Design a protein around this ligand. Structure first.
Ligand SMILES: CS(=O)(=O)NCc1ccc(-c2cccc(C(=O)O)c2)cc1
Ligand SMILES: [Cl-]
Length: 242
């Protein structure tokens, strides 16, 4: 079932922000959100698309493994961490768009379209340029649709090899301590209004998994840290993490 908890709106109001957090309790098969409407509103996935993009590149052999080095093309860009060599792990960590644009060009329109339909990913529409449609093309996905996709990935139920899914979940590793593990991916969509930030993934506990997907209005990059901060406040409130 689904349950709306508007008390979470305080975590956005507190920060002069608007957004949605969607939680899914895997053991109980129950979902929770502050805003049922926005939970089902579809936005550009931006760098959260690096999850499916990584899966497709690996399954087709465009990426051999997580150690393969993708050499910097020598073009200086405004994000210093992009001006260096990367592998799959670091390209995900630093959300290195130009590495994944090359992935998409090697994947090609036909195979990209087939794979996103096989994944049931969002509106499955890659209209636009093959190397930028997740930033300014026609593809759209909602917070609830992110969770449906992530749940299949967690259970190795996507229509790619188990190896491809294991590698991507490794690359999603964001935080780990004695109490929980977070595998997630951030997103930042600026090319089409409304500008939003994403954070999607899950929290692994000893005996349960909580999937999450959040997006929030992001008029400037100054508030990007709120994607994780707001999500963790909700997780703390619901006593999922200490
Ligand atoms: C129109 S703009 O000038 O406001 N945006 C340009 C811009 C700003 C930040 C990034 C970036 C890079 C790496 C990580 C993250 C993140 O959110 O984790 C955001 C990319 C591009
Ligand atoms: Cl791992």
């Amino acid at each position: 079932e689904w349950q709306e908890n508007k008390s979470w709106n305080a975590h956005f109001t507190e920060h002069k922000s608007q957004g949605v957090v969607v939680l899914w309790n895997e053991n109980k098969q129950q979902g929770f959100t502050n805003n049922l409407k926005r939970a089902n509103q579809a936005f550009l996935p931006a760098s959260t698309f690096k999850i499916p993009n990584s899966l497709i590149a690996l399954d087709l052999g465009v990426v051999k493994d997580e150690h393969q080095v993708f050499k910097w093309d020598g073009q200086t860009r405004d994000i210093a961490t992009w001006n260096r060599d990367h592998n799959l792990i670091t390209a995900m960590k630093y959300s290195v768009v130009p590495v994944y644009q090359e992935f998409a060009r090697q994947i090609g329109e036909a195979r990209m379209s087939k794979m996103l339909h096989a994944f049931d990913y969002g509106n499955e529409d890659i209209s636009g340029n093959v190397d930028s449609f997740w930033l300014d093309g026609g593809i759209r996905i909602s917070a609830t649709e992110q969770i449906s996709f992530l749940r299949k990935l967690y259970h190795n139920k996507l229509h790619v090899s188990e190896r491809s899914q294991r590698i991507v979940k490794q690359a999603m590793l964001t935080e780990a301590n004695g109490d929980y593990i977070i595998r997630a991916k951030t997103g930042y969509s600026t090319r089409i209004e409304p500008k939003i930030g994403w954070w999607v993934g899950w929290v692994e506990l000893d005996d349960n998994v909580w999937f999450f997907a959040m997006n929030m209005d992001m008029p400037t990059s100054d508030g990007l840290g709120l994607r994780q901060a707001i999500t963790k406040e909700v997780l703390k409130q619901e006593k999922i993490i200490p």
